[PDB]
């Protein structure tokens, strides 16, 4: 049935994932086009609006940092987290500037271009490394997703391409949303990106399930979780044939309501 979290542990190859989706090279052209659009939207979200603060927690980061490049302009501290241990190790290779770490330069350069070339690649990378304070295990399915570690409430919760993969059905998706809210202060921002109407994605021969949700369904689930949707955009691009069956992606910004009861 739907991919279990133990299948992630035993099947998810971080370096392979990065090469296939985030190399930003001459192949995987559909994946490149989506990446371009994601970077554009994340730039708008984090640089052009009021999504700023002290602490941002990224949920289901996997081995990627593309989703944090504009964010580090607006947040002093970033916590990254994922369920899959090997993803966390891959991330650490890059954070620690190790030989054989994934080459993020073409992505970094693109983001720097988007932001008006106020800094160069090396400076942007240093800024993000400094911003990333913790690399933690997380499980979105749990009432306490970070295992109940003592952390201040976040000003922003970010999650990219995670919830659809981690939730077998809409009731589970609703639960994951509730679980995430436990980490966010009232007035805080929820920034989410995910595939639309996708029931699977591939990493080579390895297949991983996805919950196919249309944009209206995502809207309704987020609103019913209490969030005022401040921004919502659809990315009309599709992943490569046989790589996924998605029809576009979305990005959104929600604000958690003030405390009442
Ligand atoms: N129950 C769960 N809790 C937290 N993360 C989970 C999870 N189940 C799967 N994941 C993670 O969801 C990720 C999907 S791949 C997404 C990676 C990255 N955020 C990007 O934008 O490309 C994987 O890293 C996987 O480890
Ligand atoms: C590229 N990618 C990564 C994670 C999830 C998906 C999807 N839910 O279809 C796609």
Residue 139 known to bind ligand: yes
Query: What DSSP character marks residue 41?
Result: H
Query: In DSSP terms, which residues pair with 254 in a beta bridge?
Result: 190, 229
Kindly identify the ligand whose nearest atom is closest to the C-alpha of 194. 2
CATH code of the domain in which 248 resides: 3.40.50.150
Q: How many domains is the chain built from? A: 1
Q: Is the CB of 165 under 6 A from ligand 2?
A: yes
Expressed in angstroms and rounded, the spacing between residue 148 Cα and the centre of ligand 2 is: 27
Give the residue whose CA is nearest to atom 19 of ligand 1.
61
C-alpha 238/C-alpha 34 separation (Å) is: 7
Expressed in angstroms and rounded, the spacing between residue 233 Cα and the centre of ligand 2 is: 17
C-alpha 91/C-alpha 63 separation (Å) is: 5
After which residues is the backbone of the chain broken at C–N > 2.5 Å?
none
Residue 194 known to bind ligand: yes
C-alpha 156/C-alpha 158 separation (Å) is: 6
Range of the domain at 44: 1-261
Short-list 125, 180, 129, CA closest to 158:
180
Terminus-to-terminus CA distance in the chain, angstroms?
39
C-alpha 249/C-alpha 134 separation (Å) is: 28
Residue 74 known to bind ligand: no
Exp. method: X-ray
Short-list 84, 16, 46, CA closest to 243:
16
Expressed in angstroms and rounded, the spacing between residue 244 Cα and the centre of ligand 2 is: 8
Q: Are 112 and 43 contacting, i.e. CB atoms less than 8 angstroms apart?
A: no
Is the torsion defined by CA of 105, 107, 110, 111 positive or negative?
negative
Resolution, Å (one decimal) = 1.9
Kindly identify the ligand whose nearest atom is closest to the C-alpha of 248. 2
Expressed in angstroms and rounded, the spacing between residue 97 Cα and the centre of ligand 1 is: 23
Expressed in angstroms and rounded, the spacing between residue 70 Cα and the centre of ligand 1 is: 20
Contacts of 91 (CB under 8 A, 6+ apart): 61, 62, 63, 64, 65, 80, 82, 135
Short-list 46, 70, 67, 75, CA closest to 118:
70
Q: Is the CB of 195 under 6 A from ligand 2?
A: yes
* Number of H-type helices and E-type strands within the chain: 9, 9
The residue with tokens 């720097």 is: 112
Expressed in angstroms and rounded, the spacing between residue 236 Cα and the centre of ligand 2 is: 15
Nearest atom of ligand 2 to the alpha carbon of 194? 8
Phi, psi of 148 (to 5 degrees): 75, 20
Nearest atom of ligand 1 to the alpha carbon of 67? 21
| Helical (H) or strand (E) element with 166 | helix 163-166
Over the range 233-257, which residues count as b (16 or more CB within 10 Å of their CB) and which as e? bebebbbeeebbbbbbbbbbbbbbe
Alpha helices in 28-160 (DSSP H): 29-47, 85-95, 105-114, 121-131
Kindly identify the ligand whose nearest atom is closest to the C-alpha of 197. 2
Give the residue whose CA is nearest to atom 11 of ligand 1.
60
């Amino acid at each position: 049935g739907f991919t279990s979290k133990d299948t992630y542990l035993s099947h998810f190859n971080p370096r392979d994932y990065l090469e296939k989706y985030y190399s930003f090279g001459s192949r995987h052209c559909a994946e490149n086009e989506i990446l371009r659009h994601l970077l554009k939207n994340l730039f708008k979200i984090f640089c052009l609006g009021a999504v700023k603060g002290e602490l941002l927690i990224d949920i289901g980061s996997g081995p990627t940092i593309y989703q944090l490049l504009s964010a580090c302009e607006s947040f002093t501290e970033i916590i990254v987290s994922d369920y899959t241990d090997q993803n966390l190790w891959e991330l650490q290779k890059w954070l620690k500037k190790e030989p054989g770490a994934f080459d993020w330069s073409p992505v970094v350069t693109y983001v720097c271009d988007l932001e008006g070339n106020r800094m160069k690649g090396p400076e942007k990378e240093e800024k993000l490394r400094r911003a990333i304070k913790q690399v933690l295990k997380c499980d979105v399915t749990q009432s306490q997703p970070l295992g109940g570690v003592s952390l201040p409430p976040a000003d922003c919760l970010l999650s990219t391409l995670c919830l659809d993969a981690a939730c077998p059905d809409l009731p589970a998706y609703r639960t994951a949303l509730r679980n995430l809210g436990s980490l966010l202060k009232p007035g805080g921002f929820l920034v989410m990106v995910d595939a639309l109407k996708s029931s699977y994605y591939m990493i080579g021969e390895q297949k991983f399930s996805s919950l196919p949700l249309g944009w209206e369904t995502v809207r309704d689930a987020v609103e019913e979780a209490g969030y005022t949707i401040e921004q919502f955009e659809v990315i009309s691009q599709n992943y490569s044939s046989t790589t996924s069956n998605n029809e576009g992606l979305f990005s959104l910004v929600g604000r958690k309501p003030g405390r009442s009861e």
